């Protein structure tokens, strides 16, 4: 309510959620880049289980067991979840299931209260125009973000600040409206939050950490890929600047 009251008198709050917190408002289903952030390790073993043929080495069952301390609880995804196996045709099905009964089933009756209050004030059908991107942007404002600021601390591996690659990167980032910078801040960040001081003080979940630019290892077809645990995206090696403009756009819209 107090925040759906906040849009609906053109207010700005600092109420900066998580991207899986901005989809569920906007009923849009959570994917295995929401659980990078929270567990690595997590999206590491689902992402082998969607790229590799484990039909015969699988060896699981399309239930999973949490423990509930004393004994532990076996929960069904679907109907009869714990008879139905895992399958290169159900490899999707249960790795989209498995996402949301990671983060979604102990945030559920919590985002469902929000929902609640603040579709009570903003419609539901006017606000589902934005994206889970521009939901963030609605709610809390559209920051003008300084790209000297953001150049002078952001470290490279991989690369110098004179990097053909990065020179373009700049360029591009340059070159973006204040709507195209504030996404691409929020892609490799996770947020269109900046500190008072600015890029200098910026910092990821696991303490400060002023963004990252790596060497992606990926040919020029290849797309950026984010880290938002450490505000790093890996930017790989292009071979022109309206590449790398066209990937980099790609990357922060999906």
């Not at 289903?29 to 929270?38: I, R």
């Not at 980032?173 to 890029?199: H, I």
Request: proline residues 2%; aromatic residues 12%.
């Amino acid at each position: 309510r107090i925040i759906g009251k906040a849009v609906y008198d053109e207010m700005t709050v600092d109420c900066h959620f998580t991207r899986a917190f901005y989809k569920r408002v906007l009923s849009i289903p959570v994917d295995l880049t929401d659980v990078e952030a929270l567990d690595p390790e997590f999206h590491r073993s689902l992402v082998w289980i969607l790229e590799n043929d484990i039909e015969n080495v699988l060896d699981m069952t399309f239930s999973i067991e949490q423990d509930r301390f004393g004994i532990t609880e076996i929960i069904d995804l679907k109907e009869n979840g714990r008879n139905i196996a895992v399958t290169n045709e159900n490899k999707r099905e249960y790795v989209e299931l498995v996402c949301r009964f990671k983060l979604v089933r102990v945030i559920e009756r919590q985002l469902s209260a929000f929902a609640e209050g603040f579709f009570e004030i903003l419609d539901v059908d006017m606000l589902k125009m934005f994206n889970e991107k521009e939901l963030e942007l609605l709610i809390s404002g559209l920051p003008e973000i300084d790209v000297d600021d953001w150049r002078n601390n952001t470290i490279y591996f991989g690369y110098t600040s004179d990097s053909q690659v990065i020179r373009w990167y700049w360029r591009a980032v340059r070159n973006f409206s204040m709507e195209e910078r504030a996404k691409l801040l929020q892609f490799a960040t996770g947020t269109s939050k900046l500190p008072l001081e600015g890029f200098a003080g910026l910092r990821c979940q696991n303490g400060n950490q002023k963004f990252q630019i790596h060497k992606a290892s990926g040919g020029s077809s290849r797309l950026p890929t984010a880290h938002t645990a450490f505000n790093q995206l890996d930017l790989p090696e292009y071979d022109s600047y309206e590449q790398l403009v066209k990937a980099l756009l790609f990357s922060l819209e999906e």
